[PDB]
């Protein structure tokens, strides 16, 4: 099953797909079955060397199967639990790419779906590195509406001219350089309540 | 466990003994793991078949 | 998950992201079990051959599995360790050009 | 002592190690390596720049 709906919104560890459990549920359950005996078979045996009863060889091999068994059922339980494929961040997950009845592999190249958090949404601006000194400094001295520690407050315009609602924050640390144009990438933060934005758009922080 | 006093009065069908059935319970989960895996297995290639 | 924030600083040695380490933190344990076992096999029939006990041939095909384990483990402890990938050096780190979940 | 692109006077001061670091063989420039103290971050790579 591929329970969750496209485009819906999903919380960070949801259940988004169940592959079927059938073989991976039995192999543990025998798994599980095995250790109970040789467990027991062990345990039974480390009384028996204490009284020379069998030799240390046989409490050996014994305590060795039991080792092995052990080791079984936790690789079991492990390929079970992945059986319930769950989602790794709250947000919104699109369109999935892989549908009910499909053979999944471990290791396969293309991803399932993708889920992505839209609110807040990051809006990336890009500057000249002087530029952004410039800000830097406008931001220290007082010409700035201090948003934060280090952000200023911003407004934001859409592509199609409307001024969006909300007011955001633009912090200042820079998280990318085009060593090439000498460019710098600043990220601004808006809040989406209402998923009125969506990545892609081409916008205008104020 | 022995379940029952020396001397007392049982009545037919009653528990006088307990094994440990630790593995027994153990081993027939397994089992039914098993058979659930293998009977779904098996209803579906029958209509694999069919076609 | 990528425990680090996009621009920010990180130390060297700093851990950076998380490798779903579940079935390496598994095969370790897994193979330390085997030499814990094949270790004790070897160290008896070392005394044995020492006694005639047991062939030199036996004693042999115990130490190699031995040999064979104790290699194992070495080599499971090496991929454990690098589920934790960490920052060669300090520095202030970018965007992540990996997502989460991602492979 | 270093002046940024927009003509600006970094306020610290530093270093300029005449040791080469590289020589382009082919118009036989020179390239040497100044090093300044950016505790604030303030400088950032690929910014054009003259080292005074």
């Known amino acids: 099953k591929r329970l969750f709906k496209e485009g819906s919104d999903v919380k960070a560890?949801?259940?988004?797909?169940?592959?079927?459990?059938?073989?991976?549920?039995?192999?543990?359950?025998?798994?599980?079955?095995?250790?109970?005996?040789?467990?027991?078979?062990?345990?039974?045996?480390?009384?028996?060397?204490?009284?020379?009863?069998?030799?240390?060889?046989?409490?050996?091999?014994?305590?060795?199967?039991?080792?092995?068994?052990?080791?079984?059922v936790e690789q079991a339980r492990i390929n079970l639990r992945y059986t319930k494929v769950l989602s790794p961040i709250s947000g919104r997950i699109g369109r999935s790419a892989v549908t009910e009845g499909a053979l999944v592999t471990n290791g396969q190249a293309n991803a399932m779906a993708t889920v992505q958090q839209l609110d807040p949404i990051y809006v990336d601006v890009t500057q000249p590195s002087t530029a952004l000194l410039r800000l830097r400094r406008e931001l220290a001295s007082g010409q700035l509406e201090r948003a934060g520690d280090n952000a200023a407050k911003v407004s934001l315009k859409l592509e199609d001219g409307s001024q969006y609602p909300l007011e955001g924050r633009l912090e200042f640390s820079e998280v990318s350089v085009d060593e090439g144009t000498g460019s710098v990438t600043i990220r601004a933060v808006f809040p989406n309540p209402n998923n009125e934005l969506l990545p892609g758009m081409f916008v205008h922080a104020q």
């Open 13 to 72: 560890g949801q259940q988004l797909y169940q592959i079927d459990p059938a073989t991976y549920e039995a192999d543990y359950q025998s798994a599980q079955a095995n250790l109970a005996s040789t467990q027991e078979q062990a345990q039974r045996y480390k009384l028996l060397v204490a009284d020379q009863a069998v030799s240390k060889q046989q409490y050996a091999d014994a305590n060795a199967a039991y080792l092995q068994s052990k080791a079984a």
